[PDB]
Amino acid sequence: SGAIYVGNYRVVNRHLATHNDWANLVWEDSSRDLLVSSTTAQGCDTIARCDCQTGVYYCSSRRKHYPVSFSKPSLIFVEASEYYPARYQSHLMLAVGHSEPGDCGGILRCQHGVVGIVSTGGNGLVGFADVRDLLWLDE
Numbered sequence: 001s002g003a004i005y006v007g008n009y010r011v012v013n014r015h016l017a018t019h020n021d022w023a024n025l026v027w028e029d030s031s032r033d034l035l036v037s038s039t040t041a042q043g044c045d046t047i048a049r050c051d052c053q054t055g056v057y058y059c060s061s062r063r064k065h066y067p068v069s070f071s072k073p074s075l076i077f078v079e080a081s082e083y084y085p086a087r088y089q090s091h092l093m094l095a096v097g098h099s100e101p102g103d104c105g106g107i108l109r110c111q112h113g114v115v116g117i118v119s120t121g122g123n124g125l126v127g128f129a130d131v132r133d134l135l136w137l138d139e
């Protein structure tokens, strides 16, 4: 579980999105595991606009924040699931770190703000869905 709240937007994993998110849909992308829904209240999360490759992510399965080195956003194969068939997921960033299925949504942050959220994991790895290219979130 976990969301990003910037201005009149809510950013969640598309596989974890609720009925309200779909009733107030702004943009969704299956290949990125992202969904953006509109909000009534004003959100206050700063989105990072950078090329950072080091940051800190929240791990709800360990109740701890972890510093990580992460890859540049890319097309990375993800195995079949109960939400998506086997496919390349775009704008994904991998790091060495603990991830569990319910850790999806945990925020990855650098010194410049929110980078993205936990999307994939397993085998001593954690994958983050990047949100830095979505410039319309700020505007």
Ligand SMILES: CSc1ccccc1CC(=O)N1C[C@@H](C(N)=O)C[C@H]2C[C@H]21
Binding pocket: 015, 033, 078, 081, 083, 084, 089, 099, 100, 101, 102, 103, 104, 118, 119, 120, 121, 122, 123
């Ligand atoms: C971080 S979740 C996790 C953790 C350890 C091991 C396995 C998983 C499962 C995983 O990688 N997922 C990928 C996600 C996707 N983007 O397609 C769909 C939901 C099922 C989540």
Ligand SMILES: [Zn+2]
Binding pocket: 048, 049, 050, 051, 052, 110, 111, 112, 113
């Ligand atoms: Zn940064």
